[PDB]
Amino acid sequence: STGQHPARYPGAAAGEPTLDSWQEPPHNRWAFAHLGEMVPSAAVSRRPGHALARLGAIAAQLPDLEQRLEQTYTDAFLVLRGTEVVAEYYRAGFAPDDRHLLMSVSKSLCGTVVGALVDEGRIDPAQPVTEYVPELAGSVYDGPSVLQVLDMQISIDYNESEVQTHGRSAGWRTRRHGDPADTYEFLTTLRGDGSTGEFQYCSANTDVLAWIVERVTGLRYVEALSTYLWAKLDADRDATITVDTTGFGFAHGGVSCTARDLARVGRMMLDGGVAPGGRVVSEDWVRRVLAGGSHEAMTDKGFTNTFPDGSYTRQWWCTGNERGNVSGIGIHGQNLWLDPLTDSVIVKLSSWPDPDTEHWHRLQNGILLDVSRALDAV
């Protein structure tokens, strides 16, 4: 048993509605206004072919930038310098206001929600996970602190299999018989040797954070992500997030939004944690993110080969490079990239044919770094 979870609507029974009950009362009142949460759905456009390239400013310094973006399967690219959009690119068929899957850039959004609750004094990172989610007793999350989840310094037996099972449990892939019912149940199945302190990138960590958020606030993670972050950004559009059969948002990977709106998250980070709608996280939280995590914990050569002094903290990758670059990162080429030096945010949303190869990362990081340097005063 995974304990109490936020009801899908006021008074809803646990787990209700399901794909088979949503037409029945009392479910149908909510379901009729939220059917996309139950059944896959397409937009029917209220608006009735060519790539949009407005690289302009930095185009002078980077002549072949558009070709480089094409080579890295770029769907949306946006550079925010201060409060100004100084460069934009969208591939043919992807509109400026279209939303794009964030993959694990979603994690950095989740960490931000956790940080907001730390700022409020409702989460103490030093406390064990089980202080907030007792039902994780007996799992690999029995013992580690919330901060160790945030920094992903927990040794976990997570086949990178657990990765497929995780997706099946959450509805990203077709369910197999014997699979856990939902994301919460999947998390309780996870085991490890009990060691901590070394970085191990594991998507399960972020979903535990979201579960903690739910227990602390009583809100569905879907709503917490809005209340503590999205609704304070003055975003152009809602974000979306995939949900599993209990309505639990896929915190570690399932958010989609526009490139411009994602940049508003970076802007908030470079503004000391303050957004147009109010403070999201504390100045201290932002400083700790920009400062990085323990370097010695970071033993992922896939990262340190490019960023030798890099680290990871609070759901952000920290390059530790001379620019102090930090980034949200998601597979197939998603970055929410911060360049504090120039007070700039770079959003790149892509669809590399492959999820995570040295080849694509090399090309992608080359672009992000070149664009960052192009923004330097000269």
Side-chain angles (χ1 to χ4, degrees):
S1 67
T2 58
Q4 187 158 53
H5 303 300
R8 197 82 90 123
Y9 58 82
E16 293 279 18
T18 63
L19 193 58
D20 299 294
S21 71
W22 61 268
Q23 295 190 56
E24 311 170 353
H27 312 308
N28 57 13
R29 305 215 72 185
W30 173 84
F32 288 1
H34 303 88
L35 189 55
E37 293 195 33
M38 306 302 299
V39 181
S41 301
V44 180
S45 181
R46 64 181 178 81
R47 308 168 182 177
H50 241 343
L52 177 56
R54 298 181 56 189
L55 306 174
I58 46 66
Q61 303 92 286
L62 308 172
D64 59 337
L65 181 54
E66 175 164 11
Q67 178 172 54
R68 293 177 70 186
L69 294 180
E70 297 178 334
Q71 293 177 16
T72 53
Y73 288 77
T74 302
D75 302 320
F77 175 80
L78 187 149
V79 179
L80 189 76
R81 183 181 63 185
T83 59
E84 177 187 22
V85 179
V86 297
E88 288 187 271
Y89 170 89
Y90 308 93
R91 66 164 169 78
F94 189 95
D97 61 328
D98 280 342
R99 292 187 290 237
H100 190 291
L101 176 58
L102 299 185
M103 292 298 197
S104 282
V105 170
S106 300
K107 293 183 168 62
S108 305
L109 271 43
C110 183
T112 300
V113 175
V114 174
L117 295 169
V118 172
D119 184 34
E120 290 188 355
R122 309 193 66 184
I123 294 176
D124 178 353
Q127 288 294 316
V129 174
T130 52
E131 165 65 17
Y132 302 104
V133 183
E135 287 80 4
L136 277 170
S139 73
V140 68
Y141 290 104
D142 185 354
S145 65
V146 175
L147 181 54
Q148 285 174 319
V149 182
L150 280 161
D151 289 351
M152 300 221 182
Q153 290 170 5
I154 303 170
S155 184
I156 304 173
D157 183 6
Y158 190 94
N159 195 148
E160 286 286 3
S161 69
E162 276 68 20
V163 59
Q164 298 297 298
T165 300
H166 195 164
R168 294 195 306 272
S169 302
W172 269 34
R173 299 183 53 79
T174 297
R175 180 181 191 79
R176 295 168 53 200
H177 187 58
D179 280 341
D182 51 51
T183 309
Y184 307 111
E185 183 181 324
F186 167 79
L187 297 174
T188 65
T189 69
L190 296 174
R191 298 293 182 270
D193 62 16
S195 65
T196 58
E198 186 177 354
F199 175 75
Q200 185 189 320
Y201 183 70
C202 182
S203 287
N205 285 330
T206 310
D207 295 336
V208 170
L209 293 180
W211 191 351
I212 291 166
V213 170
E214 292 191 331
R215 283 297 286 276
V216 168
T217 64
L219 303 174
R220 293 178 67 202
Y221 178 68
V222 168
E223 180 172 348
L225 180 60
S226 174
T227 299
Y228 293 95
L229 175 54
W230 205 255
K232 298 181 179 191
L233 297 177
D234 189 23
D236 297 313
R237 302 193 67 193
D238 290 352
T240 62
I241 188 174
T242 65
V243 294
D244 69 11
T245 53
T246 71
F248 182 60
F250 199 49
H252 88 240
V255 180
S256 298
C257 66
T258 70
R260 179 62 184 89
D261 281 345
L262 181 62
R264 301 176 195 283
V265 179
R267 186 64 259 151
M268 173 273 299
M269 289 294 290
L270 295 185
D271 284 335
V274 181
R279 175 170 294 284
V280 174
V281 295
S282 71
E283 304 275 345
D284 182 70
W285 184 269
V286 174
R287 284 196 303 268
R288 293 180 183 267
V289 168
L290 294 179
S294 176
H295 296 194
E296 288 65 35
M298 174 57 65
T299 62
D300 174 12
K301 293 181 183 171
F303 191 62
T304 59
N305 282 349
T306 301
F307 305 112
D309 296 312
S311 63
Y312 185 103
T313 184
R314 295 165 171 73
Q315 305 293 287
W316 290 89
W317 294 88
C318 309
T319 64
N321 71 10
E322 61 184 301
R323 302 186 66 85
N325 290 125
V326 300
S327 188
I329 304 176
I331 55 173
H332 298 273
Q334 329 312 331
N335 287 86
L336 172 53
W337 172 277
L338 308 185
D339 194 54
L341 222 41
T342 64
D343 196 29
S344 296
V345 183
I346 303 174
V347 171
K348 188 170 188 292
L349 302 174
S350 316
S351 36
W352 306 338
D354 314 290
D356 183 11
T357 66
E358 299 189 343
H359 170 71
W360 292 126
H361 280 290
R362 177 176 68 76
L363 291 174
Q364 182 111 336
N365 283 322
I367 293 165
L368 297 172
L369 290 162
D370 283 350
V371 173
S372 294
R373 288 186 289 253
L375 296 163
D376 284 341
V378 62

